[PDB]
Amino acid sequence: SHMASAEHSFDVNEVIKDFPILDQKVNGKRLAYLDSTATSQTPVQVLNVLEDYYKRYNSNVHRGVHTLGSLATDGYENARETVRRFINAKYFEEIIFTRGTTASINLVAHSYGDANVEEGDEIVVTEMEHHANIVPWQQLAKRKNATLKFIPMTADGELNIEDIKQTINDKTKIVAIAHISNVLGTINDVKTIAEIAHQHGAIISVDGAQAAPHMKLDMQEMNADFYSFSGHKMLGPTGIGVLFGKRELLQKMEPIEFGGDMIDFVSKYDATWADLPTKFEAGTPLIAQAIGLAEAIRYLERIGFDAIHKYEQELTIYAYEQMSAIEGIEIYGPPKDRRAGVITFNLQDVHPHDVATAVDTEGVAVRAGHHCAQPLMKWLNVSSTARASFYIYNTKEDVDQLINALKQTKEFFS
Amino acid sequence: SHMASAEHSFDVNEVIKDFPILDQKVNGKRLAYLDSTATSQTPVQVLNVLEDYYKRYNSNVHRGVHTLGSLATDGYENARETVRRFINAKYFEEIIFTRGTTASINLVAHSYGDANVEEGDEIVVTEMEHHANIVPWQQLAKRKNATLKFIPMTADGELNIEDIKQTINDKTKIVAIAHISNVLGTINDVKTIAEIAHQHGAIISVDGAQAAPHMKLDMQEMNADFYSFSGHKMLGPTGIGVLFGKRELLQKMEPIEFGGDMIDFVSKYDATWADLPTKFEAGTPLIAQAIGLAEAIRYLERIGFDAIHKYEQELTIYAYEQMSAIEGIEIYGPPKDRRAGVITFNLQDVHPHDVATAVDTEGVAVRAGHHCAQPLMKWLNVSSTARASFYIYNTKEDVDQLINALKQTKEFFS
């Protein structure tokens, strides 16, 4: 088929050999892991770099120290440089390591938000946002008596340019938006939204958790003010994310966590802060996790995003077409050729929790629930949905295993 | 010798076989890693558990999901239970995972501090505190126009009961104190200080980063309100720590980071919070790191703290005596038999940065600088010091290698 050709061109079988977790059975059936949107699997190259760190040069990080300490510092600094190049940030000091996208957005909303939002200012969000890109803005609005505004969505769950222009105005201080929806697969035009924000004297904070794993990012082209993502969704270790911020903005923002490393001087009653980026990195860093995340970036770069985007789009269109052919499947969001590698759906007369349970019995991992997007579920007029997602280690066989399992589930519940 | 006997009894050579990082040379000399206070080394048992997680059951965490997801959730919940038992917390929900001791103390100071400290209240600290246990209290005092008070220290860097009783009064709301000093080796009587706090209607927040790796902790006996520590100092992975808090207190405290997992329900403008402990755990957890930290706890428990305390005390007394015999060495803090496994020192007429550089050329890893304790350095009337620290994988040979390197350093600079 067309999908066999896409598999062969991408060399997907050689990619899968790097992911030992996929070589197992679940409930006696081969594993078809279709939940990468929740967290990705991790290649041996990343695991080998983590093992090497702990077996060869673990130490705390500080410029000019004993031998292992200076190797650990080199590895941590090299990891930040790898991230800077990955997203084409202008400066090393514009990359902040955090616990994840959620911690990144919370740092923007506390540190930037409290210094730049007052009573009567507006913060623009959307109903497709993950909780991590809604609730911090709700809390900033409550602290400041500011107003939260939602960009109206089209019937297919996209943002029309005229709705974007009508919602952003000269009262807007912050536009906070997903680059890619974790549910609908919508790809927002963040470059254009940034331009409209900037015309009104607002800044843009982008939730890029579902974009960084899947497409090339260029902070300078996009002209985002802040951009946030998570390592565990892009082949990296748990516990690490990134906040990109323009240097001019980060310089004026105050830290919100205090301790070692982020200080320059401490007396009994006062303290001064370190330079960027360490101003925002209190305590001992995520040292092993940063080193592993840099290896995950090199894994993605070695394949390249043009190859990853083509393969993911072929998988996604194939899955969308095969799932659409099952009578009773409803897919939410844009058409097959206008979406990222996610399909959120319901099966007529079968609760999505029972879909997820049933396909796991067939070896297939999907998620069911609200996907941390309760306002989106309400916008769809549902409580829960089921969600399959694709990444670089998925195959036609994985999609066909889901399709057969859904047909078996229809039969079981009929 | 007495130290050879202690080595043999502890089976230190078998412990060292678990730490492949120690089996290397630095500058052509065997590695003598004497910087565990900064971060510990990591045994293969912990590395094997981390590798197994990524090769067998990585997935995001949620009760009742697909097979790998339910294994990851089990591992994360089991890890929290392991921590609860390790410190004898009454309830599972009193254990919060954080990024580290610094993040733990910052959560207390923001969430508990802002709700319980007002103008004219007092916060008690000490000049031996790490920056992580000073600067958050400075910032809480500034937010609230409250007053920071310091418990006077004895000439040996300890806290006299009469100075403790004179500094704590009915205005005190929070006593924030180290269990063990990262510099002096002082072991504070936190059980007694907690009693004095409680008599005055204050709470106690304990910095236990240097105690959790080295001694048995019992939250119920101690009667601490909050207790904070870091995994990387106790054989665990980087990027994880613990906050213990009494359930009654944590129930009333508000979260300070917002997103997925920590919410129950989200609408466009409002949100409700999850139950403890997840109320304080926004975003995707530190899943691999928690699982590794539980394995580190089982490694320490298998040896037991009575054996670890005896071995560390024998090493410490041996090192204190051998270093004291070098003319020109000044050791800071209490006597050899009243300290934890740390020796902070200076060598007459040799800057401590040059000591650290010189002994690294001899394969020995120590730290030089302020040790994130600038107010303590000022209290000692120095800028910088050098610091050697001991843990379960250190030997008489490591101490003798430091002693010979210090004598060689004296010679080089004379």
Q: Within a domain: residue A42? A: no
Q: Any CB–CB contact under 8 A between B25 and chain A? A: no
d(Cα A28, Cα B254) in Å, to the nearest integer?
Answer: 45
What is chain B's length?
Answer: 414
d(Cα B91, Cα B391) in Å, to the nearest integer?
Answer: 30
d(Cα B226, Cα B163) in Å, to the nearest integer?
Answer: 22
The DSSP code for A148 is E
Total domain count, chain A: 2
Closest CA to A276 of A133, A80, A101, A136: A80
Structure tokens at A308: 């990853």
Cα-based distances in Å from A162 to A166, A193, B10: 6, 11, 74
**DSSP per residue, A298-338:** HHHHHH-HHHHHHHHHHHHHHHHHHHHTSTTEEE-SS-TTS
d(Cα B237, Cα B369) in Å, to the nearest integer?
Answer: 25
Angle at B370 between CA A111 and CA B344, to 5 degrees: 140
d(Cα B185, Cα B317) in Å, to the nearest integer?
Answer: 12
Q: Any CB–CB contact under 8 A between B289 and chain A? A: yes
Q: Within a domain: residue B102? A: yes
Q: How many residue contacts between A and B have a Cβ separation below 8 Å?
A: 264
CB A240 within 8 A of CB A293: yes
- Please list, in sequence order, all residues whose beta carbon lies within 8 angstroms of the beta carbon of residue B2, skipping any fewer than 6 positions away: B314, B318
Closest CA to A211 of A203, A222, A201, A225: A222
d(Cα B264, Cα B48) in Å, to the nearest integer?
Answer: 35
Cα-based distances in Å from A211 to A42, A85, A396, B108: 18, 16, 23, 34
B254 and B152 in one domain? Answer: yes
Q: Do B132 and A282 touch (CB under 8 A)?
A: yes
Catalytic residue among A372, A375, A384, A413: A372
d(Cα A350, Cα B21) in Å, to the nearest integer?
Answer: 54
Which of B245, B267, B301 terminates a domain? The answer is: B301
Nearest to B39 among A127, A284, A286 (CB): A284
Cα-based distances in Å from A124 to A171, A211, A286, A290: 10, 20, 32, 32
Q: Do B54 and A35 touch (CB under 8 A)?
A: no
A289 and A316 in one domain? Answer: no
Q: Do B374 and A100 touch (CB under 8 A)?
A: no
Q: Within a domain: residue B36? A: no
B87 and B13 in one domain? Answer: no
B256: closest chain A residue by CA: A106
Closest CA to A107 of A242, A213, A14, A17: A242
Q: Do A58 and B47 touch (CB under 8 A)?
A: no
Which of B269, B301, B333 terminates a domain? The answer is: B301
d(Cα A33, Cα A56) in Å, to the nearest integer?
Answer: 33
Closest CA to A206 of A129, A279, A142, A151: A129
CB A339 within 8 A of CB A186: yes
B331 and B270 in one domain? Answer: no
The DSSP code for A339 is S
Which of A267, A301, A335 terminates a domain? The answer is: A301
- Please list, in sequence order, all residues whose beta carbon lies within 8 angstroms of the beta carbon of residue A218, skipping any fewer than 6 positions away: A87, A88
Structure tokens at B239: 């990027």
Q: Any CB–CB contact under 8 A between B242 and chain A? A: no
B270 and B153 in one domain? Answer: yes
Q: Do A39 and B33 touch (CB under 8 A)?
A: no
CA A412 to chain centre: 35
Structure tokens at A109: 């909303």
Q: Do A47 and B55 touch (CB under 8 A)?
A: yes
A371: helix, strand or coil: coil
- CA R_g for chain A: 22
Closest CA to A66 of B41, B364, B72, B369: B364
B101 and B19 in one domain? Answer: no
CATH of the domain at B200: 3.40.640.10
Q: Within a domain: residue B204? A: yes
Q: Do A266 and B134 touch (CB under 8 A)?
A: yes
Cα separation of the two ends of chain A:
32
Query: Which residues of chain A make contact with B132, given a CB cutoff of 8 A?
Result: 258-260, 282-283
Going by their DSSP bridges, the two strands A122-125 and A172-178 should be labelled as parallel
CB A15 within 8 A of CB A393: yes
d(Cα B405, Cα B410) in Å, to the nearest integer?
Answer: 9
CA B23 to chain centre: 26
Q: Within a domain: residue A121? A: yes
A36: helix, strand or coil: coil
Query: Which residues of chain B make contact with A47, given a CB cutoff of 8 A?
Result: 51, 54-55
- Please list, in sequence order, all residues whose beta carbon lies within 8 angstroms of the beta carbon of residue A328, skipping any fewer than 6 positions away: A347, A348, A349, A350, A410
Domain that holds residue B234: 47-301
Query: Which residues of chain A make contact with B134, given a CB cutoff of 8 A?
Result: 266, 268, 271
- Please list, in sequence order, all residues whose beta carbon lies within 8 angstroms of the beta carbon of residue A17, skipping any fewer than 6 positions away: none
B342 and B406 in one domain? Answer: yes
Closest CA to B329 of B392, B387, B286: B387
A150 and A206 in one domain? Answer: yes
Experimental method: X-ray
> Bridge-partner residues for B228, per DSSP?
B207, B243
d(Cα B138, Cα A270) in Å, to the nearest integer?
Answer: 7
B56: closest chain A residue by CA: A21
Q: In degrees rounded to 5, what are phi and psi of residue B242?
A: -130, 140
B347 and B285 in one domain? Answer: no
Query: Which residues of chain B make contact with A100, given a CB cutoff of 8 A?
Result: 283-284
B58: closest chain A residue by CA: A41
Closest CA to B156 of B130, B128, B190: B128
What is chain A's length?
Answer: 414
CB A10 within 8 A of CB A318: no
The DSSP code for A124 is E
Q: Within a domain: residue B393? A: yes
Please give, rounded to a whole number of angstroms, the shortest distance from the CA of B327 to a CA of chain A.
Answer: 24
Residue A100 amino acid letter = G
Please give, rounded to a whole number of angstroms, the shortest distance from the CA of A102 to a CA of chain B.
Answer: 5
Query: Which residues of chain A make contact with B47, given a CB cutoff of 8 A?
Result: 51, 54-55
Please tell me what resolution, in angstroms, this structure has.
1.4
Q: Do B66 and A360 touch (CB under 8 A)?
A: yes
A297 and A370 in one domain? Answer: no
Cα separation of the two ends of chain B:
32
Nearest to A265 among B67, B130, B374 (CB): B374
Closest CA to A82 of A302, A317, A251: A302
d(Cα B201, Cα B168) in Å, to the nearest integer?
Answer: 10
d(Cα A191, Cα A189) in Å, to the nearest integer?
Answer: 6
A178 and A192 in one domain? Answer: yes
Three-state SS for chain B is: CHHHHHHHHHCHHHHHHCCHHHCCEECCEECEECCCCCCCCCCHHHHHHHHHHHHHHCCCCCCCCCHHHHHHHHHHHHHHHHHHHHCCCCCHHHEEEECCHHHHHHHHHHHHHHHHCCCCCEEEECCCCCHHHCHHHHHHHHHHCCEEEECCCCCCCCCCHHHHHHHCCCCEEEEEEECECCCCCCECCHHHHHHHHHHCCCEEEEECCCCCCCCCCCHHHHCCCEEEEEHHHCCCCCCCEEEEECHHHHHHCCCCCCCCCCEEEECCCCEEECCCCHHHCCCCCCHHHHHHHHHHHHHHHHHCHHHHHHHHHHHHHHHHHHHHCCCCEEECCCCCCCCCCEEEEEECCECHHHHHHHHHHCCEECEEECCCCHHHHHHHCCCCEEEEECCCCCCHHHHHHHHHHHHHHHHHHC
* B:65-94 residues touching chain A, CB 8 A cutoff: 65-69
Nearest to A239 among B101, B267, B286 (CB): B286
- Longest CA span, chain A: 72
Q: Within a domain: residue A203? A: yes
Query: Which residues of chain B make contact with A33, given a CB cutoff of 8 A?
Result: 68
Angle at A131 between CA B244 and CA A294, to 5 degrees: 75
Query: Which residues of chain A make contact with B374, given a CB cutoff of 8 A?
Result: 265-267
Cα-based distances in Å from A55 to A45, A257, A286: 15, 31, 17
Count CB-CB contacts under 10 A for residue B156: 13
By annotation, the residues of B acting in catalysis are 372
Q: Within a domain: residue B357? A: yes
Structure tokens at B379: 């209290």
CATH of the domain at A339: 3.90.1150.10
Nearest to A51 among B51, B127, B269 (CB): B51
A141: closest chain B residue by CA: B269
B322 and B296 in one domain? Answer: no
